[PDB]
Amino acid sequence: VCGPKKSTNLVKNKCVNFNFNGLTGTGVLTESNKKFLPFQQFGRDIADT
Amino acid sequence: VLYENQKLIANQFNSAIGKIQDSLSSTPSALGKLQDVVNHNAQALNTLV
Question: What is the DSSP string of chain A?
Fold first, then answer.
């Protein structure tokens, strides 16, 4: 259930504000080598980030 | 006492030095103190996050 606001082209390898399904943050987006199962959408590390 | 037993003392020192390496490598607890230090630091950082 998201909203009017529109889907900007995905910018990678740049410090970009990102809003993924209401999860907002700051960082660079890079190709990910970890293999998610079909079901998860979020990834977290040992530090709970 | 040294000069009359120079070869024996040299051999004993060499044997003890040789045994030092094996004694350090055999038991991981010998260096544990230093490891403990590092571990503590890690824990502190971890709990902060």
Answer: ---SS-------SS-EEEEETTEEEEE------S---SS------TT--
Residues linked to residue A24 through DSSP beta bridges, in sequence order: A19
Q: Which residues pair with A26 in a beta bridge?
A: A17
* Nearest residue to A42 via CA among A28, A21, A26, A27: A21
Give the bridge partners for A23, in sequence order. A20
Solved by what technique? cryo-EM
Q: Using CB atoms and an 8 Å cut-off, which of residues 17-46 of chain B contact chain A? A: 46
Amino acid at A40: Q
Tell me if chain A has a CB within 8 Å of the CB of B49. Answer: yes
Q: Residue count of chain B, please give it.
A: 49
Residues facing B13 on adjacent strands: none
